[PDB]
Design a protein around this ligand. Structure first.
Ligand SMILES: *[C@@H]1O[C@H](CO)[C@@H](O[C@@H]2O[C@H](CO)[C@@H](O[C@@H]3O[C@H](CO)[C@@H](O)[C@H](O)[C@@H]3O)[C@H](O)[C@H]2NC(C)=O)[C@H](O)[C@H]1NC(C)=O
Ligand SMILES: *[C@@H]1O[C@H](CO)[C@@H](O[C@@H]2O[C@H](CO)[C@@H](O)[C@H](O)[C@H]2NC(C)=O)[C@H](O)[C@H]1NC(C)=O
Ligand SMILES: *[C@@H]1O[C@H](CO)[C@@H](O)[C@H](O)[C@H]1NC(C)=O
Lengths: 31, 43, 47, 49
C-alpha cells in the first residue's frame, strides 16, 4: 500500500478524464 | 495537384508511379511507409 | 531502483493497477542495451 | 546527412547537420517515450504488416 500511495500522489498531475500508463523509476516490490 | 478518382478505372500517377487501375479506400492499417508495391514492381 | 516499472492509472471513476503482461507488450518501449550496442531479442519495436 | 524519416519514410531533407537542438515534452498527458542514438549496421530483419 506504500507503493500504491506513492502512485496516488504521483498521478495528481493527470487530467480529470484520462486513462494512462505511467513509466518511471518507481519503488518496486522485490529488492 | 492531388485529384483522386475512386471506385472507377483511372489513369493514375501516384508519387511518381504510373499505370491504369481501380483505386479504392480500404479499412486496413499500415503504420509505416508511403506506398506499397509488388514483386513485379507494380503499385 | 535500477529500471522502469509501468502502472496503469484510471481517473474516470483514481485507480492504480499493475501492468505486467499483455498490456506491458503495448507500451513497454524501453530496453537495456547489450554490449556492442545490440537490441535484445525480446524487444517489441513498437515505435 | 539531413534526411528526415517519419514512420520509416524519407519525406524531406536539408543540408548536412552538425548539431540538433530540441525541447520536447508530452506534458500533463503522463506519456513516456525514448530517444535513441544509433549507428548503421547490416542485419537480417523479419517484417510483418
Ligand atoms: C501510441 O499509440 C498506440 C496505438 O496507435 C498505443 O498502442 C495501443 O495500446 C493499447 C493499450 O494501451 C492497446 O489496447 C488493447 O487492445 C486489445 C484489443 O485486442 C485489448 O484486449 C487490450 O486490453 C487493450 O485494450 C492497443 O491495441 C495498442 N495499439 C497498438 C499497439 O497499435 C501506444 O500505447 C501509444 N504509445 C504509448 C507510449 O503509450
Ligand atoms: C486526403 O485526405 C484528406 C483529409 O481527410 C482529404 O481532404 C478532405 O476532403 C474532403 C472532401 O472534399 C473535404 O470536404 C475536406 O475539407 C478535406 N479536408 C481537408 C483538411 O482539406 C483529401 O481530399 C484526401 N486526398 C485525396 C487526393 O483524396
Ligand atoms: C473491412 O470491411 C469488410 C467488409 O467489407 C470486413 O469484412 C473487414 O473485416 C473490415 N476490416 C477491417 C480491418 O475493419
Amino acid at each position: 500500500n506504500l507503493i500504491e500511495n506513492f502512485l496516488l500522489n504521483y498521478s495528481i498531475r493527470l487530467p480529470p478524464n484520462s486513462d494512462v500508463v505511467l513509466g518511471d523509476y518507481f519503488p518496486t516490490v522485490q529488492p | 495537384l492531388s485529384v483522386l478518382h475512386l471506385d472507377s478505372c483511372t489513369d493514375y500517377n501516384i508519387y511518381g508511379r504510373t499505370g491504369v487501375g481501380v483505386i479504392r479506400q480500404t479499412n486496413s492499417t499500415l503504420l509505416s511507409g508511403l506506398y506499397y508495391t509488388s514483386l513485379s514492381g507494380d503499385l | 531502483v535500477y529500471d522502469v516499472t509501468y502502472y496503469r492509472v484510471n481517473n474516470k471513476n483514481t485507480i492504480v493497477s499493475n501492468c505486467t503482461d499483455q498490456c506491458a507488450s503495448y507500451v513497454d518501449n524501453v530496453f537495456t542495451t547489450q554490449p556492442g550496442g545490440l537490441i535484445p531479442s525480446d524487444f517489441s519495436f513498437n515505435n | 546527412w539531413g534526411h528526415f524519416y517519419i514512420n520509416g519514410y524519407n519525406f524531406f531533407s536539408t543540408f548536412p547537420i552538425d548539431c540538433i537542438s530540441f525541447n520536447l515534452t508530452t506534458g500533463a498527458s503522463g506519456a513516456f517515450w525514448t530517444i535513441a542514438y544509433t549507428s548503421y549496421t547490416e542485419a537480417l530483419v523479419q517484417v510483418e504488416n
